[PDB]
């Protein structure tokens, strides 16, 4: 055994190399949405036509 | 000539026979309308689907 001392754990070094790049299937902050402006309640829609 | 006197013109006699019957292409007082409840302004509709 050893004393897992206060000053012992060094800061974990992150890898270095090229910059990290996004891989999400859909962007998250920069996206925006073209509203429909509140259709009726009985009118169902096959989604293409609403789009 | 003759004097078209005040008392001369008898009341025109309407014909007599069976009762008069409607022939309009669409009834007029008794009809009613199933509303759509105010759709949007951009959504055009081929009329069957609105009906």
UniProtKB/Swiss-Prot annotation, chains A, B:
It is found in: Host cytoplasm; Host nucleus. Phosphorylated on serines and threonines by host kinases, including human casein kinase II. Influenza RNA polymerase is composed of three subunits: PB1, PB2 and PA. Interacts (via C-terminus) with PB1 (via N-terminus). Belongs to the influenza viruses PA family. Plays an essential role in viral RNA transcription and replication by forming the heterotrimeric polymerase complex together with PB1 and PB2 subunits. The complex transcribes viral mRNAs by using a unique mechanism called cap-snatching. It consists in the hijacking and cleavage of host capped pre-mRNAs. These short capped RNAs are then used as primers for viral mRNAs. The PB2 subunit is responsible for the binding of the 5' cap of cellular pre-mRNAs which are subsequently cleaved after 10-13 nucleotides by the PA subunit that carries the endonuclease activity. This is Polymerase acidic protein. It comes from Influenza A virus (strain A/Northern Territory/60/1968 H3N2). The gene is PA. The chain holds residues 257 to 307 of 716 of the full protein.
